[model samples]
Target: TQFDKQYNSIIKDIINNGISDEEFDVRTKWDSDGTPAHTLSVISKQMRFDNSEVPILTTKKVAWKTAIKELLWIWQLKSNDVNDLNMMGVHIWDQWKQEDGTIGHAYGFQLGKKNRSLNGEKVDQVDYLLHQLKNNPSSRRHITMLWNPDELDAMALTPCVYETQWYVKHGKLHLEVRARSNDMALGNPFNVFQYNVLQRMIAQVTGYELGEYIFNIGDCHVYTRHIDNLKIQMEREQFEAPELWINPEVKDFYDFTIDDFKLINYKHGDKLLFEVAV
Candidate 1:
């Protein structure tokens, strides 16, 4: 499968580079509720990829328009609301929203609270992203926020408080996500693919080419539930990734409607269904 090719190549590189003596143990297990999950971890340095490196895999594909809309969907979101996502058949956020419709900055507001900063200025994630796009267009540092301090005290569920960075260099957009904790077998696939689509969207809007989607997960694990699904995915064949097309007429970010995007030739092994861990 194409996924294996890329996965193996990455593993090979990690071994050849002499980064560490430890090896990544890949395993499958089931959750307490009988859900499928896969867990993988590196015993050395964190997993890292860049555009300059060889392509990871070419089987997973998403349209450029759909990718952008998803990013916009995350940014334009006012609260930790999942209704908008449910409207588009993407219900991954359902288990994370608070009862009052707030996700407490886990998705797109990870770094926009008052008095939280590297220096003294409070940073708004969205504004910082736009600024990076304009000022350091060639820098690989477009990042988003997903952690809010208050959420820990208020919300019942919240993901890790960390930021993700995207870099645009040499006409290719690269993504680097830093997750303090990650469910590798199940969650990483969704997070990696979703952000890859996001990189495509940002590239489309900013006039760059799509390149690599790299994930840097600190505590990447697999719940006991998704073992079967991982095994099934491993058994299936992977096809070439499809090209994503979007209407070039829509320049400004806010001007885009759902109709401006299109996904072409998206082929996958099978659609795995599971409930969110609320």
Candidate 2:
């Protein structure tokens, strides 16, 4: 996959450069509430493309069907809770789940809640997305939000306060994710795949074809301690992203359950472990 090639090329560059003075640095700090913490520093880059480039990278071609499944999986779960995620062999957020089986409203639910002030009136993210599709179907403003400042304070986890944007242009749906704070070695990979799947799902539902996915990560950092794990992932080749399948009979987003989706023939390399700054 061309996307993978570009992603790997940059990662390889960072690895070869070595994390040292004028190269990369990890700093320690105290949070607003006087909590101590440390995180790695990352360099940021902007990626843009026309309709010709592939949106994602993998070892093999994947079906859009599987991509849809994962998207619904997140929405269906409704909480940032990672308990169910482990059952699928993904432990990316294992260290983040709260005792209540929730991880703050930082994923889908945050996007779905009604905010009376943001858009002049109360509007949920799902409705906001549908409204954008109806009024400006061709506009590149088809976006949904996930992070909420208040939710972060209420939970034990640290929010990756950022925004993700999706658009439909030239008969294809495009996605752009901007991360204010990122753990490149861990969080970014899962986020990249997760949003890619989201793009495909929205495209499938709206009758548009898939298109480019652009990632703009700000403060993209990797923990100094996780350097070794990142190297291991860099050495391993990416497997094919699976096809996403959703039941067409379920039109309402809330009606679509786990049973309504299927991941057909997904293949992946070893799962990597990383800690969430909860």
Candidate 3:
């Protein structure tokens, strides 16, 4: 599979060519025992995916449903409360939960806020993008941003996969995602899979064919502790890519639920757990 080929190649490239932070003075999240964490890192990495197949990791089991649920929590529910996601059985945001039970003005909060005026109507980024995709498919201004510098202090963790720009070319909906940082071993796969599902859902609701997915990362790295497990994953055989199925009746983006999606033929290896940095 093209995804597997690219995934393995990138992993190997980072292992061989990534620079170590130990060579320079830097600050990072501390490990559970209070040791500063670091990574073998690469810069300005990009990858492409086609909507012809679902892009979940094949070498190891990815929590595809968790990924999708998180997507909904951000884009559909337009929520920032950890409790909202926790109630859905997703604890991904638990580590970042603040004392107020929210991740602050990040992710969904950025998308859901009606801070921008569109045609005299105050609209959130998600709604504005949806309106443009449906009413003005040829427009070149479909974008949603999550990097809010002004609110960084309030956020539990700064957004990594921050911005997404959408394009409708020849009746196919395409997406380009920009991330300031990525945890290659864990977060990268989840980001790719969720964004692909995002593109598919947007295309479905907006009446466009599924198109390409472009991912651009500024700092792509594998945590030092995850290196060995990642190699084990790389050595595993790649399986066939799965197909994504969405409930065709779901015309409204906010109406999507976990029950509305399925991964047909999603066979993969065992799940691998990797430590996450704060």
Query: TM-score per candidate, in order?
Result: 0.65, 0.66, 0.94
TM-score for predicted model 2 compared with the true structure: 0.66
RMSD of 2: 6.1
lDDT of 2 at 55: 40
lDDT of 3 by residue, 1-278 (tens): 36777888888989999998976655766557667778888899888877667777888888889989999999999999999999999886798888899988788898888987889999999888898888888787788888877877777778888999898899888899998988888788888888888888888888898788998999988888888998899889888888878998998888888999988998888878787665
lDDT of each: 0.52, 0.58, 0.85
Ranking by lDDT: 3, 2, 1
Question: Candidate 1 — what's its lDDT?
Answer: 0.52
Stretch of 10 with least lDDT, candidate 1: 53-62
- All candidates: CA RMSD in angstroms? 6.5, 6.1, 1.6
Better of 2 and 3 by TM-score: 3
Candidate 1 C-alpha lDDT tens digits along 34-141:
433333344322455443322223333323344344565665443345667667666655666677655654554444333324346665665556556766687645
Q: By lDDT, who's the top model here?
A: 3
* Model 2 alpha-carbon drift over 4 Å, by segment: 17-40, 46-109, 116-122, 139-141, 147-152, 237-242, 246-250, 270-278
- lDDT value, residue 89 of candidate 3: 97
Which pairs, if any, clash in model 2? 4-57, 63-243, 64-244, 65-243, 65-244, 65-245, 66-243, 66-244, 67-244
